[PDB]
Design a protein around this ligand. Sequence first.
Ligand SMILES: OC[C@H]1O[C@H](O[C@H]2[C@H](O)[C@@H](O)[C@@H](O[C@H]3[C@H](O)[C@@H](O)[C@@H](O)O[C@@H]3CO)O[C@@H]2CO)[C@H](O)[C@@H](O)[C@@H]1O
Ligand SMILES: [Ca+2]
Ligand SMILES: [Ca+2]
Length: 415
Amino acid sequence: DQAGKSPAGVRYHGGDEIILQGFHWNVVREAPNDWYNILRQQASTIAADGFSAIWMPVPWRDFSSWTKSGGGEGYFWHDFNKNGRYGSDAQLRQAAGALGGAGVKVLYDVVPNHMNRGYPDKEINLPAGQGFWRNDCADPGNYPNDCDDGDRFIGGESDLNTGHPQIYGMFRDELANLRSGYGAGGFRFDFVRGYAPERVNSWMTDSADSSFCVGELWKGPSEYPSWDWRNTASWQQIIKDWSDRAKCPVFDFALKERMQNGSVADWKHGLNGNPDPRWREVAVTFVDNHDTGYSPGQNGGQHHWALQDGLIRQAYAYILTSPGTPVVYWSHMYDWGYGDFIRQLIQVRRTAGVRADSAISFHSGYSGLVATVSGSQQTLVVALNSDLANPGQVASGSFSEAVNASNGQVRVWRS
Ligand SMILES: OC[C@H]1O[C@H](O[C@H]2[C@H](O)[C@@H](O)[C@@H](O[C@H]3[C@H](O)[C@@H](O)[C@@H](O)O[C@@H]3CO)O[C@@H]2CO)[C@H](O)[C@@H](O)[C@@H]1O
Ligand SMILES: [Ca+2]
Ligand SMILES: [Ca+2]
């Protein structure tokens, strides 16, 4: 496991991570108060499946409830107490210790933008009129105001002023607490449109400078004002600009947008396919998460932007053979039966030595997506939904078949 920042100082922890999203949306309802126990028991299996890191649910307790129905998942926490719906503080420490002991770095989901301001019994009670809250200042719409230098969550009545020195320091100290007491090897920053990217750089510099980070910026060009250069920019440009300012990797919503809206051939326009290594190496690729994808249980989860089942194998083959840093969704791996396929592709990635900055070339004469990827140990030829017949049509050298699935719709060959 290589540590180390990128040539531009971005915290991609060596560029060699393979991440498991270690939950789905309905965990708090499908395994009440038992998820940490489950992760502890599964730690050795997760490691044996080839993951170097696990993205943990928000560890701050959330007893919210709304009505579709939901609540409790961590994105409306009321304080930092760890005795929440995933399990107790003691069980969290045991799970994090088991995962670390198995070689799996623990990444915590953290939610600085807002909190359950209205919850009756909590340990953090911030009054009005002292600058702690976005709506201490005039709030005319979903854009920065004098108490919140980013966007707001829905109505904004629970957005925190993360730039207030007291609030900044509260989160700084809690990140340090997760590192010292809960085994954190990094963090996933939620809703990063809600606050300044430079504040993520500051928090990481203060409390976890050598750790892995990733931010979730889900905001299309249409959501920016007419006079903002991002209104006419690509999805790639928008997320790359965030990464530059946070010095953090960023979820590849450019790739996700092409997977949802474009053809398979168009998947080459994700951030992770960019020919500039400073661009593609900061991409954190994924197929679905707890928000975009389905989950087992009530209402099938959120499924706000889910990839159809006819493309799931192709999408995992792409992200696991290509540059950027890939994330595997719990439910594909361990609920819905794609685990053996994903296990095989993780082994292919590791055997080939594909890393976040590996070169990737796209080839034009065929249907679907045809790519050659230069790993540190092997070259891969990847053909997805393609009429490519054999790797010698597009690459020099001697190749052996590594993957052949879905009636040849997923094929990978290796040097
Ligand atoms: O009446 C205003 C009050 O209610 C609303 O907040 C609730 C949302 O309506 C509700 O959807 C849910 O939000 C969750 C998201 O659906 C989910 O995708 C994920 O991001 O976690 C969210 C938080 O759990 O819960 C919130 C808060 O209970 C309204 O947005 C606000 O003006 C205010 O909270
Ligand atoms: Ca690493
Ligand atoms: Ca905000």
